[PDB]
Amino acid sequence: VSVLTMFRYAGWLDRLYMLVGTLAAIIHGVALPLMMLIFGDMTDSFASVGNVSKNSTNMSEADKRAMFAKLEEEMTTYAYYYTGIGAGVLIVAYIQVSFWCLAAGRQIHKIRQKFFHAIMNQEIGWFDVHDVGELNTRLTDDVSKINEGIGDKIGMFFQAMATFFGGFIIGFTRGWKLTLVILAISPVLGLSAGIWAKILSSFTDKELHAYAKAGAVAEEVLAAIRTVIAFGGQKKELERYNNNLEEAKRLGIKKAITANISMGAAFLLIYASYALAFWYGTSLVISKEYSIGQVLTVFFSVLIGAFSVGQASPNIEAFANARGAAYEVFKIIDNKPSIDSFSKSGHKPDNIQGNLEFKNIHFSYPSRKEVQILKGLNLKVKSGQTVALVGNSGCGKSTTVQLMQRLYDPLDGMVSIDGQDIRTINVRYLREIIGVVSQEPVLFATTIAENIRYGREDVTMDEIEKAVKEANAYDFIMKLPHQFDTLVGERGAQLSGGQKQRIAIARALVRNPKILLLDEATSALDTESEAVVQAALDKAREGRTTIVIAHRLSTVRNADVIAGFDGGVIVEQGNHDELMREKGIYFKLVMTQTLDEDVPPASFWRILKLNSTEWPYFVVGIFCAIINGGLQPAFSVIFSKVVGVFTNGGPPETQRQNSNLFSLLFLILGIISFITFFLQGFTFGKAGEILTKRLRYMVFKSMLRQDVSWFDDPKNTTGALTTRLANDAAQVKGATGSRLAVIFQNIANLGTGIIISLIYGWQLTLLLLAIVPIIAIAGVVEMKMLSGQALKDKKELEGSGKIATEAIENFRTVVSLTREQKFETMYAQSLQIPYRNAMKKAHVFGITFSFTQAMMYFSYAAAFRFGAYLVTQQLMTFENVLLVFSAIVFGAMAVGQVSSFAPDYAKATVSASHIIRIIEKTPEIDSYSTQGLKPNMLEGNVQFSGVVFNYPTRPSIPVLQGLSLEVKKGQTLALVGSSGCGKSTVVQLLERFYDPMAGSVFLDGKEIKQLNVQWLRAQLGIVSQEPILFDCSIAENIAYGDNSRVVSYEEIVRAAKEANIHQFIDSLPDKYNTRVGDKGTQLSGGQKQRIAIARALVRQPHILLLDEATSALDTESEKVVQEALDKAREGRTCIVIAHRLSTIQNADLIVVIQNGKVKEHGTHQQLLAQKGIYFSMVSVQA
């Protein structure tokens, strides 16, 4: 079912090219061993010449002619063969790559449109359940994975098995024993991979749990940053994060060490197998004469067949993970379970004037177990009326409105519009006959003309005009620039909410429904605009049967009929007077209410500087890189010598020669290889480990010691910072790894390859390095062109995805239903551009890889043609021919190196650039000295003079302009302003979060500028709006060590005693030792505030600061907390900016701050006796 068959579905003509491409992938994979079968045949003919050169030379003139004639024949075979295979792999590569794009393109585009349709066709279900909107984005990433699954990855898979099965085929066919030997040594290679699976996979996960502790500490500190800053508890958070880092690093070292050990054993088994393969390959020639040394290399090509399984595994994982992600959700992704709504058919009533009927309706939202919110209902409103509903116990009114649009089919009973059931009539038509003005208006990002046009697609500006005129929306739009062509700026949030709703009214007005549903449309709006929108609603009524729910009973007064519920069942119904008459529910309520990142700057060799500072010395790492570096070419020399004594050499000692080279190849390569992998792993493992620690430490610490809009007003976030701390330090660990990688391959290829090249017949080196770097560049340009396509594709789907996410995230598109098909139609038109683009990139993806494989034969071409033949005949021996393989494999060796181990620099360098720019910091105000703390400074009189300030946004209309205040010690400084900030900013400047732009601020009369940054924050009573405690024992929270300040039990006792939180301290288990229970989820606001107050008065500040402390709070809690504050303050300087003017009535100096400039100031009775702003504030506060 869904696992295999369904995944590939449809694609009638697609499947044909799918199979053609598959076939070309097969013959492509087949091509590689055939090129290597040729290699054994070419070796034999090439071999026979050397035998006469060493031994006989009986006749001379004959050999210079005939042997080379034979060589020329081999030149002819060389030429038609490498070429035949080359043209083959060129064509078939272009085809097999054409497979992804051509098949997957149509498959995925079909998936895309069907997915978008099923998504819009599930209706209610999507908003009720699943991941609540955030899911289908991820899902379009899933269809992107689908795109990755059915692509050429499969073609590569068949190619791989073709090289595998075909490799072993040729192996068995031209001899059967060595294949068998290699297969016997083969499972050993699979066992070594077992070290990988147990240790490596586990230790990644092991280390993560360790740093998880470090992440939690870093998570909260950076979120609680202004609090820890204000209290200066930084160095302690420093300490915790350092301990957790200390554990995470030791799990890091075990990971690196073991990893390198594993890869090391892998190479052991590789050189071991390679050698044993030579021992049995050699045993078949000298004392036997089966192989002439032809097949011996081809049987190694059977090892290329062994590499083909390793090349196969990722493609399967690419198919499976794409398959698995798609098919499990594909049944849910696609089709249409639906059938409570759908889109189509049904019954069309044309009578269009009717009576709504609710009959015995029992319903529960499909949250299931929730008790029926509506259990039974009977309500019937005659045509032309306006019915108003009210309730107490909750939901159940909104439910009836929800049911009326058939958003939910009732469990029992029926809703009948006119005489017909609602379930008979067409859903689309039903939605079209029912207009709805919701409590929360919504405007799509488009013109107001289009937002209306979403009400009805086919419409003209005359109807738009009459619409807004009828919605009285024709005023603000005219004054608004661009008129009807006026965009809704910054997505859909631009203008007044009353205007938004009013526009929504015009939109529903174009709909011209005979039923109008108003759910709290007036709610959450200012009273004036409330009355305006209300007027629009009133002009929209009486021509339409309607139902209105709101919490302002003034609008409920003029309703023809009002309905009470209390538990979901209808109880009272009738005219207003009748309801007040009943002294019921209505009368009861009436009387009751009376991660964008990455700046340009780059490291430039500065990485190794921080490394060397934290990497004290390691010459053993680089030395290990040298001996492994020189280890690879030893192989190329040895291998040359193996076949070397077979071609050029005499009959005696050949057996011994093979034994010696076998053993030399085994221990000299394999053992030393184990040594170097375990040694470097032992070096760079601890190197990168401690680098990751010291880096993460000095980062989190460089971060905590700087604030200044990195925290106060950042474009950053807590998560981005934690991410910085983890990932980046891991990357600089790779940055350090690349150094050793570079010196290693430096001596490994260039140095030894060149030195060895000096002993050549010359001439070969130049031609060889005229190839390898070029094909290397071809490998670079392949990845680059690849990323260019990835980016352009992602940008196109980006735009289509943006407008798609716009559709799916807004569920109200269903209330008009006009936009159901309209949105996916436009989106279809959006998806159209990349589709046509796909065939073009089909050729792009297609021709490139073909050309890449076109370099396969050309490498072998220039190699053996010019290598053998013409270079041969003078100064050419058993070496320098196989040394071709040396310098060639050396280039490939580097490839192996670059495409493995540490990250491809890049991200490492960049992450390093950030982690470095962060550790450099911008210390500004940090700790240092800056003052002496005269004992006599305990006064507390805060001066402000000519102070201007702006948060770091220049044209933000700065909150401080020309501001000056004063407060004497031991007295209350009241503060009042319009709302929000400029209130708080004074407090922040006193906290010295930022030193003001101009003017000055004083505490004892000294300038804050000249005051100690720390000691200024040493006496402050700062208590914020929403108090946040360090996660710790509440006793330990109460006492925050400033510097040397010890945890004092009797002191924190005095703290609780003063804060009146001692109530909870007395009771509850452990008393003071009760922890807050995961960020104080067990405590209410009054308690948290009491504790925060205790945090303040432990410090014994001469200055207390309250920023709208009781603003968010309620009932008695405000009084007991205010009482605590009052017993804490008035003995010392305090500033209360709270918006509560009833408790501000007792103050020494009340200050009204307008626009940066203090307007009025004086005691309550003084300003109140006066008249102006303050008097307005109290009069409207009442």
| Amino acid present at 813 | T
Q: Cβ(645)–Cβ(672) under 8 Å? A: no
Determine if 1031 is a binding residue for Hg ion (CB under 5 A).
yes
902: three-class secondary structure by DSSP? coil
Nearer to Hg ion, 384 or 714 (CB): 714
Query: Is residue 940 a known part of a binding site?
Result: no
The answer to whether residue 1030 forms part of the interface with Hg ion (CB under 5 A) is yes
Query: Closer to Hg ion at the Cβ: 174 or 1127?
Result: 1127
Number of residues that bind Hg ion (CB under 5 A): 17
The answer to whether the beta carbons of residues 944 and 1158 sit under 8 Å apart is: no
- Which region, judged by CB under 5 A, interacts with Hg ion, from 379-387, 673-681, 1063-1071, 1112-1120? 673-681
Q: Which is nearer to Hg ion, 543 or 952 (CB)?
A: 952
Residue 402 and residue 411: Cα distance in Å, rounded?
14
Q: Per DSSP, what are the bridge partners of residue 516?
A: 435, 546
Binding flag, residue 988, Hg ion (CB under 5 A) = no
**Collapsed DSSP state (helix, strand, coil) of residue 198:** helix
Assess contact for 349 and 418: CB atoms under 8 A: yes
Among 297, 680, 736, 1014, binds Hg ion (CB under 5 A): 680
Number of Cβ atoms within 10 Å of the Cβ of 172: 15
- Integer Cα distance of 112 and 122 in angstroms: 16
Residue type, 271: Y
* Residue 771 dihedral angles phi and psi, to the nearest 5°: -105, -65
Q: Note whether 280 binds Hg ion by CB under 5 A.
A: no
In order of 162, 464, 517, 729, the CA distances from 497 in angstroms are: 66, 20, 19, 47
Q: Minimum distance between the CB of residue 98 and Hg ion, rounded to whole angstroms?
A: 9
Q: Is 849 in the site for Hg ion (CB under 5 A)?
A: no
Residue 1150, beta-bridge partner list: 974, 1162
391 labeled binding residue: yes
One DSSP character per residue, 937-995 reads: GTT--EEEEEEEE--S-TTS--SEEEEEEEE-TTSEEEEEESSSTTTHHHHHHHTTSS-
211 binds Hg ion (CB under 5 A): no
Least distance between Hg ion and beta carbon 1134 (Å): 3
Q: Which of 898, 1134, 1152, 1177 binds Hg ion (CB under 5 A)?
A: 1134
Residue 759 interacts with Hg ion (CB under 5 A)? no
Q: Is 993 in the site for Hg ion (CB under 5 A)?
A: no
Min. distance of Cβ 257 from Hg ion in angstroms?
A: 13
Whose Cβ is closer to Hg ion: residue 144's or residue 877's?
Answer: 144
Q: Is 225 in the site for Hg ion (CB under 5 A)?
A: no
Contact status: 395 vs Hg ion (CB under 5 A): yes
Q: Does 522 bind Hg ion (CB under 5 A)?
A: no
Give SS3 for 228. helix
Please tell me what DSSP assigns to residue 218: H
Sheet of 515-519: strand order equals 434-437, 515-519, 545-549, 386-389, 561-563, 573-574
Helix (H) or strand (E) holding 173: helix 153-174
Q: Hey, which residues between 617 and 646 contact Hg ion (CB under 5 A)?
A: 624-625, 628
Interface stretch with Hg ion, choices 598-606, 670-678, 922-930, 1163-1171 (CB under 5 A): 670-678
Task: For Hg ion, give the closer residue by CB, 484 or 835.
Answer: 835
- Residues 683-722 within binding reach of Hg ion (CB under 5 A): none
User: Is the CB of 67 or the CB of 847 nearer to Hg ion?
Assistant: 847
Among 197, 620, 780, 1032, binds Hg ion (CB under 5 A): 1032
Distance CA 1161, CA 1174 (A): 9
Whether the CB-CB separation of 435 and 513 falls below 8 Å is answered with yes
Q: Which residues of 263-274 are buried (b: 16+ CB within 10 A; e: fewer)?
A: bbbbbbbbbbbb
**Residue of 39, 330, 845, 901 that binds Hg ion (CB under 5 A):** 845
- Is 100 a residue that touches Hg ion (CB under 5 A)? yes
Q: Tell me: is residue 346 an annotated ligand-binding position.
A: no
Touching Hg ion, residues 353-382 (CB under 5 A): none
126 or 857: CB nearest Hg ion: 126
- State the minimum distance, in angstroms, from the CB of residue 97 to Hg ion: 7
Pick the binder of Hg ion from 244, 632, 972, 1122 (CB under 5 A). Answer: 972
624 among annotated binding-site residues: no
Q: Which stretch binds Hg ion (CB under 5 A): 185-193, 378-386, 578-586, 841-849?
A: 841-849
Alpha carbons 386 and 561: distance in angstroms, whole number:
7
Residue 331 makes CB contacts below 8 A (sequence gap 6+) with 2
From residue 242, give the alpha-carbon distance in Å to each of 25, 717, 1123: 54, 21, 41
Q: Is 263 in the site for Hg ion (CB under 5 A)?
A: no
Asked if 1136 touches Hg ion (CB under 5 A), the answer is yes
Window of 329-337, 657-665, 1029-1037, 1171-1179 that interacts with Hg ion by CB under 5 A: 1029-1037
The residue whose two tokens read 């007077």 is: 577
Going by their DSSP bridges, the two strands 1149-1154 and 972-977 should be labelled as parallel
Has 110 been labeled as part of a binding site?
A: no
After which residues does the chain have a break in its backbone, defined as C to next N over 2.5 Å?
A: 594
Taking residues 305 to 344 in sequence order and writing x for each that binds Hg ion by CB under 5 A, - otherwise, the string is: ----------------------------------------
**Amino acid in the structure at residue 267:** F
User: Can residue 875 be called a binding residue for Hg ion (CB under 5 A)?
Assistant: no
Instruction: Scan residues 1071-1130 and list those touching Hg ion (CB under 5 A).
Output: 1129
Q: Is 567 annotated as a binding residue?
A: no
Tell whether residue 814 is a contact of Hg ion (CB under 5 A): no
- Chain positions contacting Hg ion, by CB under 5 A: 100-101, 395, 624-625, 628, 676, 680, 845, 972, 981, 1030-1032, 1129, 1134, 1136
Q: Which residues are annotated as a binding site?
A: 391-398, 977-984
Q: Which residues are annotated as a binding site for ATP?
A: 391-398, 977-984
